[PDB]
Amino acid sequence: GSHMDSSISKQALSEIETRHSEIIKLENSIRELHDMFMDMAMLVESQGEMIDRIEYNVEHAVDYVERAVSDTKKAVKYQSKARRKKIMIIICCVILGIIIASTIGGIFG
Protein backbone atom coordinates (compact mmCIF):
# COMPACT_ATOMS: atom_id res chain seq x y z
CA GLY A 1 0.00 0.00 0.00
CA SER A 2 1.10 3.57 -0.70
CA HIS A 3 -1.41 5.51 -2.80
CA MET A 4 0.28 8.41 -4.59
CA ASP A 5 3.05 10.23 -2.73
CA SER A 6 5.48 7.74 -1.19
CA SER A 7 8.71 9.65 -1.77
CA ILE A 8 11.08 7.85 0.59
CA SER A 9 9.13 4.59 0.36
CA LYS A 10 10.26 4.44 -3.27
CA GLN A 11 11.93 1.07 -2.77
CA ALA A 12 8.64 -0.71 -2.03
CA LEU A 13 7.01 1.45 -4.70
CA SER A 14 9.48 0.80 -7.52
CA GLU A 15 9.84 -2.77 -6.28
CA ILE A 16 6.88 -4.02 -8.32
CA GLU A 17 8.40 -2.08 -11.22
CA THR A 18 10.41 -5.25 -11.74
CA ARG A 19 7.54 -6.60 -13.82
CA HIS A 20 8.30 -3.93 -16.41
CA SER A 21 12.06 -4.42 -16.21
CA GLU A 22 11.77 -8.19 -16.63
CA ILE A 23 11.25 -7.78 -20.38
CA ILE A 24 14.01 -5.17 -20.56
CA LYS A 25 16.41 -7.53 -18.85
CA LEU A 26 15.66 -10.40 -21.23
CA GLU A 27 15.93 -8.16 -24.29
CA ASN A 28 19.13 -6.39 -23.24
CA SER A 29 20.43 -9.80 -22.16
CA ILE A 30 20.07 -11.08 -25.72
CA ARG A 31 21.97 -8.18 -27.27
CA GLU A 32 24.50 -8.32 -24.45
CA LEU A 33 25.24 -12.04 -24.21
CA HIS A 34 25.12 -12.17 -28.00
CA ASP A 35 28.05 -9.79 -28.44
CA MET A 36 29.93 -10.82 -25.30
CA PHE A 37 29.79 -14.36 -26.68
CA MET A 38 32.70 -13.26 -28.86
CA ASP A 39 34.37 -11.39 -26.00
CA MET A 40 34.39 -14.28 -23.55
CA ALA A 41 35.74 -16.25 -26.50
CA MET A 42 38.98 -14.34 -25.97
CA LEU A 43 39.77 -15.27 -22.37
CA VAL A 44 38.25 -18.69 -23.01
CA GLU A 45 40.79 -19.66 -25.67
CA SER A 46 43.94 -17.74 -24.80
CA GLN A 47 43.51 -16.63 -21.19
CA GLY A 48 41.51 -19.82 -20.71
CA GLU A 49 44.47 -21.24 -18.83
CA MET A 50 44.03 -18.55 -16.18
CA ILE A 51 40.26 -18.19 -16.23
CA ASP A 52 40.14 -21.93 -15.59
CA ARG A 53 41.63 -21.53 -12.14
CA ILE A 54 38.29 -19.88 -11.35
CA GLU A 55 36.63 -23.27 -11.53
CA TYR A 56 38.97 -25.17 -9.22
CA ASN A 57 38.29 -22.27 -6.85
CA VAL A 58 35.04 -24.06 -6.04
CA GLU A 59 36.64 -27.19 -4.59
CA HIS A 60 38.34 -24.78 -2.19
CA ALA A 61 35.16 -23.24 -0.81
CA VAL A 62 33.47 -26.63 -0.46
CA ASP A 63 36.64 -27.69 1.36
CA TYR A 64 36.39 -25.29 4.31
CA VAL A 65 32.67 -24.59 4.03
CA GLU A 66 31.93 -28.30 4.45
CA ARG A 67 33.46 -27.97 7.91
CA ALA A 68 31.85 -24.56 8.41
CA VAL A 69 28.26 -25.35 7.47
CA SER A 70 28.60 -28.30 9.85
CA ASP A 71 29.47 -25.93 12.70
CA THR A 72 27.36 -22.89 11.84
CA LYS A 73 24.17 -24.91 11.44
CA LYS A 74 25.22 -26.26 14.84
CA ALA A 75 25.25 -29.71 13.22
CA VAL A 76 21.81 -31.01 12.27
CA LYS A 77 21.03 -32.38 8.81
CA TYR A 78 20.78 -35.50 6.65
CA GLN A 79 22.80 -36.65 3.65
CA SER A 80 25.81 -34.78 2.28
CA LYS A 81 23.64 -33.51 -0.58
CA ALA A 82 23.14 -30.29 1.37
CA ARG A 83 26.77 -29.32 0.77
CA ARG A 84 25.51 -28.90 -2.80
CA LYS A 85 22.62 -26.48 -2.29
CA LYS A 86 24.33 -24.89 0.71
CA ILE A 87 26.53 -23.14 -1.83
CA MET A 88 23.47 -21.24 -3.03
CA ILE A 89 21.81 -20.99 0.39
CA ILE A 90 24.53 -20.32 3.00
CA ILE A 91 27.62 -19.18 1.07
CA CYS A 92 25.26 -16.96 -0.90
CA CYS A 93 23.32 -15.72 2.13
CA VAL A 94 26.59 -14.51 3.65
CA ILE A 95 27.02 -12.22 0.66
CA LEU A 96 23.67 -10.56 1.39
CA GLY A 97 25.35 -9.07 4.45
CA ILE A 98 28.17 -7.80 2.22
CA ILE A 99 25.98 -6.50 -0.60
CA ILE A 100 24.57 -3.89 1.76
CA ALA A 101 28.13 -2.74 2.43
CA SER A 102 28.35 -2.34 -1.35
CA THR A 103 25.56 0.20 -1.77
CA ILE A 104 27.25 2.00 1.11
CA GLY A 105 30.70 1.26 -0.31
CA GLY A 106 30.13 4.01 -2.87
CA ILE A 107 30.43 1.67 -5.83
CA PHE A 108 26.72 1.29 -6.53
CA GLY A 109 25.50 4.40 -4.73
N, CA, C and O atoms as a GROMACS GRO file, in nm:
protein
  436
    1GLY      N    1   0.083  -0.120   0.000
    1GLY     CA    2   0.000   0.000   0.000
    1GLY      C    3   0.086   0.126   0.000
    1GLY      O    4   0.196   0.127   0.056
    2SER      N    5   0.036   0.231  -0.063
    2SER     CA    6   0.110   0.357  -0.070
    2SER      C    7   0.018   0.470  -0.115
    2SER      O    8   0.009   0.574  -0.049
    3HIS      N    9  -0.050   0.450  -0.227
    3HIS     CA   10  -0.141   0.551  -0.280
    3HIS      C   11  -0.067   0.683  -0.301
    3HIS      O   12  -0.035   0.753  -0.204
    4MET      N   13  -0.041   0.717  -0.427
    4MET     CA   14   0.028   0.841  -0.459
    4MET      C   15   0.143   0.865  -0.362
    4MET      O   16   0.184   0.774  -0.289
    5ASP      N   17   0.195   0.987  -0.361
    5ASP     CA   18   0.305   1.023  -0.273
    5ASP      C   19   0.406   0.909  -0.263
    5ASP      O   20   0.443   0.849  -0.364
    6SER      N   21   0.451   0.880  -0.141
    6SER     CA   22   0.548   0.774  -0.119
    6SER      C   23   0.683   0.811  -0.180
    6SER      O   24   0.732   0.744  -0.270
    7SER      N   25   0.742   0.919  -0.129
    7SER     CA   26   0.871   0.965  -0.177
    7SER      C   27   0.983   0.873  -0.130
    7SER      O   28   1.048   0.807  -0.210
    8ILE      N   29   1.004   0.869   0.002
    8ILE     CA   30   1.108   0.785   0.059
    8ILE      C   31   1.078   0.637   0.035
    8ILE      O   32   1.168   0.560  -0.001
    9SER      N   33   0.953   0.598   0.056
    9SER     CA   34   0.913   0.459   0.036
    9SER      C   35   0.915   0.422  -0.112
    9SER      O   36   0.830   0.348  -0.159
   10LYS      N   37   1.014   0.474  -0.185
   10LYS     CA   38   1.026   0.444  -0.327
   10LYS      C   39   1.061   0.297  -0.348
   10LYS      O   40   1.007   0.232  -0.438
   11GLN      N   41   1.151   0.246  -0.265
   11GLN     CA   42   1.193   0.107  -0.277
   11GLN      C   43   1.071   0.016  -0.297
   11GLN      O   44   1.058  -0.050  -0.400
   12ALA      N   45   0.984   0.013  -0.197
   12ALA     CA   46   0.864  -0.071  -0.203
   12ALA      C   47   0.776  -0.031  -0.321
   12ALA      O   48   0.704  -0.114  -0.377
   13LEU      N   49   0.781   0.097  -0.358
   13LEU     CA   50   0.701   0.145  -0.470
   13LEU      C   51   0.756   0.090  -0.602
   13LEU      O   52   0.687   0.020  -0.675
   14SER      N   53   0.881   0.124  -0.630
   14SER     CA   54   0.948   0.080  -0.752
   14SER      C   55   0.965  -0.071  -0.754
   14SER      O   56   0.977  -0.132  -0.861
   15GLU      N   57   0.966  -0.132  -0.637
   15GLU     CA   58   0.984  -0.277  -0.628
   15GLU      C   59   0.905  -0.349  -0.736
   15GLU      O   60   0.963  -0.417  -0.821
   16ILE      N   61   0.773  -0.335  -0.733
   16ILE     CA   62   0.688  -0.402  -0.832
   16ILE      C   63   0.730  -0.366  -0.974
   16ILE      O   64   0.701  -0.441  -1.068
   17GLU      N   65   0.796  -0.253  -0.990
   17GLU     CA   66   0.840  -0.208  -1.122
   17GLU      C   67   0.933  -0.309  -1.187
   17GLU      O   68   0.984  -0.286  -1.296
   18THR      N   69   0.955  -0.422  -1.120
   18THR     CA   70   1.041  -0.525  -1.174
   18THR      C   71   0.968  -0.602  -1.284
   18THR      O   72   1.031  -0.668  -1.367
   19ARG      N   73   0.836  -0.593  -1.282
   19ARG     CA   74   0.754  -0.660  -1.382
   19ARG      C   75   0.774  -0.595  -1.519
   19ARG      O   76   0.757  -0.659  -1.622
   20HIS      N   77   0.809  -0.467  -1.517
   20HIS     CA   78   0.830  -0.392  -1.641
   20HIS      C   79   0.975  -0.404  -1.686
   20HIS      O   80   1.006  -0.390  -1.804
   21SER      N   81   1.064  -0.429  -1.590
   21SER     CA   82   1.206  -0.442  -1.621
   21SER      C   83   1.237  -0.584  -1.669
   21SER      O   84   1.333  -0.606  -1.744
   22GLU      N   85   1.157  -0.679  -1.625
   22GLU     CA   86   1.177  -0.819  -1.663
   22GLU      C   87   1.202  -0.831  -1.813
   22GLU      O   88   1.301  -0.890  -1.856
   23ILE      N   89   1.111  -0.774  -1.892
   23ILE     CA   90   1.125  -0.778  -2.038
   23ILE      C   91   1.254  -0.709  -2.081
   23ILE      O   92   1.328  -0.761  -2.165
   24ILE      N   93   1.281  -0.592  -2.023
   24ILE     CA   94   1.401  -0.517  -2.056
   24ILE      C   95   1.525  -0.601  -2.033
   24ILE      O   96   1.616  -0.603  -2.116
   25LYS      N   97   1.528  -0.669  -1.920
   25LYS     CA   98   1.641  -0.753  -1.885
   25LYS      C   99   1.663  -0.860  -1.992
   25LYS      O  100   1.773  -0.874  -2.045
   26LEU      N  101   1.557  -0.934  -2.023
   26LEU     CA  102   1.566  -1.040  -2.123
   26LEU      C  103   1.617  -0.984  -2.256
   26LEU      O  104   1.712  -1.038  -2.314
   27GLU      N  105   1.554  -0.878  -2.303
   27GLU     CA  106   1.593  -0.816  -2.429
   27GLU      C  107   1.740  -0.775  -2.428
   27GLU      O  108   1.820  -0.822  -2.509
   28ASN      N  109   1.776  -0.687  -2.334
   28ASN     CA  110   1.913  -0.639  -2.324
   28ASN      C  111   2.010  -0.755  -2.302
   28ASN      O  112   2.127  -0.747  -2.338
   29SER      N  113   1.960  -0.863  -2.243
   29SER     CA  114   2.043  -0.980  -2.216
   29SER      C  115   2.076  -1.052  -2.346
   29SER      O  116   2.181  -1.116  -2.358
   30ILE      N  117   1.986  -1.042  -2.444
   30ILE     CA  118   2.007  -1.108  -2.572
   30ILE      C  119   2.112  -1.032  -2.654
   30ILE      O  120   2.198  -1.093  -2.717
   31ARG      N  121   2.103  -0.900  -2.653
   31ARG     CA  122   2.197  -0.818  -2.728
   31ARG      C  123   2.332  -0.812  -2.656
   31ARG      O  124   2.435  -0.786  -2.718
   32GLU      N  125   2.328  -0.835  -2.526
   32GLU     CA  126   2.450  -0.832  -2.446
   32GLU      C  127   2.526  -0.964  -2.458
   32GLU      O  128   2.639  -0.967  -2.505
   33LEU      N  129   2.462  -1.072  -2.414
   33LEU     CA  130   2.524  -1.204  -2.421
   33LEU      C  131   2.565  -1.236  -2.564
   33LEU      O  132   2.668  -1.300  -2.588
   34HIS      N  133   2.484  -1.192  -2.660
   34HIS     CA  134   2.512  -1.217  -2.800
   34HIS      C  135   2.652  -1.167  -2.836
   34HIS      O  136   2.737  -1.243  -2.881
   35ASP      N  137   2.675  -1.038  -2.814
   35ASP     CA  138   2.805  -0.979  -2.844
   35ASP      C  139   2.913  -1.040  -2.756
   35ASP      O  140   3.011  -1.096  -2.805
   36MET      N  141   2.895  -1.029  -2.624
   36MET     CA  142   2.993  -1.082  -2.530
   36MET      C  143   3.038  -1.222  -2.570
   36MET      O  144   3.154  -1.258  -2.552
   37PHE      N  145   2.946  -1.300  -2.625
   37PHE     CA  146   2.979  -1.436  -2.668
   37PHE      C  147   3.116  -1.438  -2.735
   37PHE      O  148   3.195  -1.529  -2.714
   38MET      N  149   3.142  -1.336  -2.816
   38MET     CA  150   3.270  -1.326  -2.886
   38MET      C  151   3.379  -1.276  -2.792
   38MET      O  152   3.496  -1.311  -2.808
   39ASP      N  153   3.340  -1.193  -2.695
   39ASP     CA  154   3.437  -1.139  -2.600
   39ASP      C  155   3.491  -1.250  -2.511
   39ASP      O  156   3.612  -1.272  -2.504
   40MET      N  157   3.401  -1.319  -2.444
   40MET     CA  158   3.439  -1.428  -2.355
   40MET      C  159   3.519  -1.533  -2.432
   40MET      O  160   3.592  -1.613  -2.374
   41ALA      N  161   3.503  -1.531  -2.564
   41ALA     CA  162   3.574  -1.625  -2.650
   41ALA      C  163   3.724  -1.598  -2.641
   41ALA      O  164   3.806  -1.687  -2.666
   42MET      N  165   3.758  -1.475  -2.608
   42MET     CA  166   3.898  -1.434  -2.597
   42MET      C  167   3.966  -1.500  -2.478
   42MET      O  168   4.062  -1.576  -2.495
   43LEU      N  169   3.918  -1.471  -2.358
   43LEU     CA  170   3.977  -1.527  -2.237
   43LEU      C  171   3.955  -1.678  -2.229
   43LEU      O  172   4.027  -1.748  -2.158
   44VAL      N  173   3.855  -1.727  -2.302
   44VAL     CA  174   3.824  -1.869  -2.301
   44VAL      C  175   3.933  -1.949  -2.374
   44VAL      O  176   3.976  -2.055  -2.326
   45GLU      N  177   3.977  -1.898  -2.488
   45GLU     CA  178   4.079  -1.966  -2.567
   45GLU      C  179   4.220  -1.939  -2.516
   45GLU      O  180   4.290  -2.030  -2.472
   46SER      N  181   4.260  -1.813  -2.523
   46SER     CA  182   4.394  -1.773  -2.480
   46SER      C  183   4.408  -1.772  -2.328
   46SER      O  184   4.475  -1.857  -2.270
   47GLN      N  185   4.344  -1.674  -2.264
   47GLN     CA  186   4.352  -1.663  -2.119
   47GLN      C  187   4.270  -1.772  -2.051
   47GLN      O  188   4.243  -1.764  -1.931
   48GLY      N  189   4.230  -1.873  -2.126
   48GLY     CA  190   4.151  -1.982  -2.070
   48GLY      C  191   4.230  -2.053  -1.962
   48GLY      O  192   4.173  -2.103  -1.865
   49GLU      N  193   4.361  -2.058  -1.980
   49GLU     CA  194   4.447  -2.124  -1.883
   49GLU      C  195   4.435  -2.059  -1.746
   49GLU      O  196   4.442  -2.127  -1.644
   50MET      N  197   4.416  -1.927  -1.744
   50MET     CA  198   4.403  -1.855  -1.618
   50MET      C  199   4.260  -1.857  -1.569
   50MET      O  200   4.233  -1.889  -1.453
   51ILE      N  201   4.168  -1.822  -1.658
   51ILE     CA  202   4.026  -1.819  -1.623
   51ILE      C  203   3.982  -1.953  -1.565
   51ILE      O  204   3.890  -1.959  -1.484
   52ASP      N  205   4.048  -2.060  -1.607
   52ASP     CA  206   4.014  -2.193  -1.559
   52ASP      C  207   4.025  -2.199  -1.407
   52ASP      O  208   3.933  -2.244  -1.338
   53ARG      N  209   4.138  -2.152  -1.357
   53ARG     CA  210   4.163  -2.153  -1.214
   53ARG      C  211   4.040  -2.108  -1.136
   53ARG      O  212   4.027  -2.138  -1.017
   54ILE      N  213   3.949  -2.036  -1.202
   54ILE     CA  214   3.829  -1.988  -1.135
   54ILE      C  215   3.740  -2.105  -1.096
   54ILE      O  216   3.671  -2.102  -0.994
   55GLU      N  217   3.743  -2.208  -1.179
   55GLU     CA  218   3.663  -2.327  -1.153
   55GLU      C  219   3.714  -2.397  -1.028
   55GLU      O  220   3.643  -2.406  -0.928
   56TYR      N  221   3.836  -2.447  -1.034
   56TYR     CA  222   3.897  -2.517  -0.922
   56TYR      C  223   3.876  -2.440  -0.791
   56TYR      O  224   3.881  -2.498  -0.683
   57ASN      N  225   3.851  -2.310  -0.803
   57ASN     CA  226   3.829  -2.227  -0.685
   57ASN      C  227   3.712  -2.280  -0.603
   57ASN      O  228   3.704  -2.259  -0.482
   58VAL      N  229   3.620  -2.349  -0.671
   58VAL     CA  230   3.504  -2.406  -0.604
   58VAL      C  231   3.548  -2.509  -0.500
   58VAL      O  232   3.520  -2.495  -0.381
   59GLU      N  233   3.616  -2.613  -0.547
   59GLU     CA  234   3.664  -2.719  -0.458
   59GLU      C  235   3.716  -2.659  -0.328
   59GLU      O  236   3.696  -2.717  -0.221
   60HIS      N  237   3.781  -2.544  -0.338
   60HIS     CA  238   3.834  -2.478  -0.219
   60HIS      C  239   3.720  -2.446  -0.122
   60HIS      O  240   3.717  -2.497  -0.010
   61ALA      N  241   3.627  -2.362  -0.166
   61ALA     CA  242   3.516  -2.324  -0.081
   61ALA      C  243   3.455  -2.448  -0.016
   61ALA      O  244   3.451  -2.459   0.106
   62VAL      N  245   3.407  -2.541  -0.098
   62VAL     CA  246   3.347  -2.663  -0.046
   62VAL      C  247   3.437  -2.729   0.058
   62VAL      O  248   3.389  -2.796   0.150
   63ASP      N  249   3.568  -2.710   0.044
   63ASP     CA  250   3.664  -2.768   0.136
   63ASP      C  251   3.642  -2.719   0.279
   63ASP      O  252   3.612  -2.797   0.369
   64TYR      N  253   3.657  -2.588   0.298
   64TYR     CA  254   3.639  -2.529   0.431
   64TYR      C  255   3.492  -2.523   0.469
   64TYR      O  256   3.453  -2.565   0.578
   65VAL      N  257   3.410  -2.471   0.378
   65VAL     CA  258   3.267  -2.459   0.404
   65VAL      C  259   3.212  -2.588   0.463
   65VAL      O  260   3.146  -2.586   0.567
   66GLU      N  261   3.240  -2.700   0.397
   66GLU     CA  262   3.193  -2.830   0.445
   66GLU      C  263   3.207  -2.840   0.596
   66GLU      O  264   3.118  -2.889   0.665
   67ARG      N  265   3.320  -2.793   0.648
   67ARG     CA  266   3.346  -2.797   0.791
   67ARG      C  267   3.277  -2.680   0.861
   67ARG      O  268   3.249  -2.686   0.981
   68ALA      N  269   3.250  -2.574   0.786
   68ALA     CA  270   3.185  -2.456   0.841
   68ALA      C  271   3.035  -2.479   0.856
   68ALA      O  272   2.981  -2.470   0.966
   69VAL      N  273   2.970  -2.510   0.745
   69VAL     CA  274   2.826  -2.535   0.747
   69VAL      C  275   2.790  -2.636   0.855
   69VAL      O  276   2.681  -2.632   0.912
   70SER      N  277   2.883  -2.728   0.883
   70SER     CA  278   2.860  -2.830   0.985
   70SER      C  279   2.860  -2.767   1.124
   70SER      O  280   2.791  -2.814   1.214
   71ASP      N  281   2.939  -2.661   1.141
   71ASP     CA  282   2.947  -2.593   1.270
   71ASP      C  283   2.839  -2.486   1.281
   71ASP      O  284   2.760  -2.487   1.375
   72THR      N  285   2.836  -2.395   1.184
   72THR     CA  286   2.736  -2.288   1.184
   72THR      C  287   2.598  -2.344   1.214
   72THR      O  288   2.536  -2.309   1.315
   73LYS      N  289   2.549  -2.431   1.126
   73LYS     CA  290   2.417  -2.491   1.144
   73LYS      C  291   2.407  -2.558   1.280
   73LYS      O  292   2.300  -2.604   1.320
   74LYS      N  293   2.520  -2.564   1.351
   74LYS     CA  294   2.522  -2.626   1.484
   74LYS      C  295   2.528  -2.778   1.472
   74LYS      O  296   2.540  -2.848   1.572
   75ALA      N  297   2.520  -2.827   1.348
   75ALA     CA  298   2.525  -2.971   1.322
   75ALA      C  299   2.386  -3.032   1.338
   75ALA      O  300   2.344  -3.068   1.448
   76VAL      N  301   2.315  -3.044   1.226
   76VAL     CA  302   2.180  -3.102   1.227
   76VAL      C  303   2.124  -3.109   1.086
   76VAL      O  304   2.058  -3.016   1.039
   77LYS      N  305   2.151  -3.220   1.018
   77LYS     CA  306   2.103  -3.238   0.881
   77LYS      C  307   2.110  -3.385   0.841
   77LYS      O  308   2.148  -3.470   0.921
   78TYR      N  309   2.075  -3.413   0.716
   78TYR     CA  310   2.078  -3.549   0.665
   78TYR      C  311   2.134  -3.553   0.524
   78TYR      O  312   2.102  -3.468   0.441
   79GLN      N  313   2.219  -3.652   0.497
   79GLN     CA  314   2.280  -3.665   0.365
   79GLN      C  315   2.377  -3.551   0.338
   79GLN      O  316   2.359  -3.440   0.388
   80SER      N  317   2.481  -3.579   0.260
   80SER     CA  318   2.581  -3.478   0.228
   80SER      C  319   2.537  -3.396   0.107
   80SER      O  320   2.610  -3.308   0.061
   81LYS      N  321   2.417  -3.424   0.058
   81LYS     CA  322   2.364  -3.351  -0.057
   81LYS      C  323   2.356  -3.202  -0.028
   81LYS      O  324   2.377  -3.119  -0.116
   82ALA      N  325   2.324  -3.169   0.097
   82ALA     CA  326   2.314  -3.029   0.137
   82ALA      C  327   2.434  -2.949   0.088
   82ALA      O  328   2.419  -2.846   0.023
   83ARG      N  329   2.554  -2.999   0.118
   83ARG     CA  330   2.676  -2.932   0.077
   83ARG      C  331   2.664  -2.878  -0.065
   83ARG      O  332   2.738  -2.787  -0.104
   84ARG      N  333   2.572  -2.934  -0.142
   84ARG     CA  334   2.551  -2.890  -0.280
   84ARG      C  335   2.471  -2.760  -0.283
   84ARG      O  336   2.519  -2.657  -0.332
   85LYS      N  337   2.349  -2.765  -0.231
   85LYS     CA  338   2.262  -2.648  -0.229
   85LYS      C  339   2.317  -2.540  -0.136
   85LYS      O  340   2.305  -2.421  -0.164
   86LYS      N  341   2.377  -2.583  -0.025
   86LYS     CA  342   2.432  -2.488   0.071
   86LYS      C  343   2.508  -2.377   0.000
   86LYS      O  344   2.505  -2.262   0.042
   87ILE      N  345   2.577  -2.413  -0.107
   87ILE     CA  346   2.653  -2.314  -0.183
   87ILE      C  347   2.564  -2.197  -0.222
   87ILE      O  348   2.605  -2.081  -0.215
   88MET      N  349   2.442  -2.228  -0.263
   88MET     CA  350   2.347  -2.124  -0.303
   88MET      C  351   2.272  -2.065  -0.183
   88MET      O  352   2.232  -1.949  -0.186
   89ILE      N  353   2.255  -2.145  -0.078
   89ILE     CA  354   2.181  -2.099   0.039
   89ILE      C  355   2.268  -2.024   0.142
   89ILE      O  356   2.244  -1.907   0.169
   90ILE      N  357   2.368  -2.092   0.197
   90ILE     CA  358   2.453  -2.032   0.300
   90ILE      C  359   2.561  -1.940   0.241
   90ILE      O  360   2.559  -1.820   0.265
   91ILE      N  361   2.654  -1.997   0.165
   91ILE     CA  362   2.762  -1.918   0.108
   91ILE      C  363   2.707  -1.795   0.036
   91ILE      O  364   2.773  -1.691   0.031
   92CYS      N  365   2.588  -1.808  -0.020
   92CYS     CA  366   2.526  -1.696  -0.090
   92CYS      C  367   2.463  -1.599   0.010
   92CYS      O  368   2.475  -1.477  -0.005
   93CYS      N  369   2.396  -1.654   0.111
   93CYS     CA  370   2.332  -1.572   0.213
   93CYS      C  371   2.433  -1.480   0.280
   93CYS      O  372   2.402  -1.365   0.313
   94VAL      N  373   2.554  -1.531   0.301
   94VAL     CA  374   2.658  -1.451   0.365
   94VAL      C  375   2.683  -1.324   0.285
   94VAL      O  376   2.704  -1.216   0.342
   95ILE      N  377   2.681  -1.336   0.153
   95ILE     CA  378   2.702  -1.222   0.066
   95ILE      C  379   2.599  -1.113   0.093
   95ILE      O  380   2.633  -0.994   0.096
   96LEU      N  381   2.474  -1.153   0.112
   96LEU     CA  382   2.368  -1.056   0.139
   96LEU      C  383   2.414  -0.952   0.240
   96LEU      O  384   2.385  -0.833   0.226
   97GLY      N  385   2.486  -0.998   0.342
   97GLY     CA  386   2.536  -0.907   0.445
   97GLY      C  387   2.642  -0.814   0.388
   97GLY      O  388   2.661  -0.703   0.437
   98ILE      N  389   2.712  -0.860   0.285
   98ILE     CA  390   2.816  -0.780   0.222
   98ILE      C  391   2.758  -0.684   0.119
   98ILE      O  392   2.802  -0.570   0.108
   99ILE      N  393   2.660  -0.732   0.043
   99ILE     CA  394   2.598  -0.650  -0.060
   99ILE      C  395   2.561  -0.513  -0.003
   99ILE      O  396   2.590  -0.410  -0.064
  100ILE      N  397   2.497  -0.514   0.113
  100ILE     CA  398   2.457  -0.389   0.176
  100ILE      C  399   2.578  -0.297   0.186
  100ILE      O  400   2.570  -0.179   0.152
  101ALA      N  401   2.690  -0.352   0.232
  101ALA     CA  402   2.813  -0.274   0.243
  101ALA      C  403   2.852  -0.217   0.107
  101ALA      O  404   2.924  -0.117   0.100
  102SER      N  405   2.806  -0.281   0.000
  102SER     CA  406   2.835  -0.234  -0.135
  102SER      C  407   2.766  -0.100  -0.160
  102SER      O  408   2.832   0.001  -0.183
  103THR      N  409   2.634  -0.101  -0.156
  103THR     CA  410   2.556   0.020  -0.177
  103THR      C  411   2.614   0.134  -0.096
  103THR      O  412   2.613   0.250  -0.139
  104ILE      N  413   2.665   0.101   0.022
  104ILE     CA  414   2.725   0.200   0.111
  104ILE      C  415   2.874   0.215   0.081
  104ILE      O  416   2.939   0.310   0.127
  105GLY      N  417   2.929   0.122   0.004
  105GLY     CA  418   3.070   0.126  -0.032
  105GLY      C  419   3.099   0.246  -0.121
  105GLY      O  420   3.209   0.300  -0.120
  106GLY      N  421   2.998   0.288  -0.198
  106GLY     CA  422   3.013   0.401  -0.287
  106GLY      C  423   3.021   0.355  -0.432
  106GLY      O  424   3.016   0.436  -0.525
  107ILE      N  425   3.033   0.225  -0.450
  107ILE     CA  426   3.043   0.167  -0.583
  107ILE      C  427   2.909   0.178  -0.655
  107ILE      O  428   2.901   0.234  -0.765
  108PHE      N  429   2.805   0.124  -0.594
  108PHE     CA  430   2.672   0.129  -0.653
  108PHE      C  431   2.609   0.266  -0.632
  108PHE      O  432   2.564   0.331  -0.726
  109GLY      N  433   2.607   0.310  -0.506
  109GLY     CA  434   2.550   0.440  -0.473
  109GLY      C  435   2.654   0.551  -0.489
  109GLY      O  436   2.624   0.668  -0.466
   0.00000   0.00000   0.00000
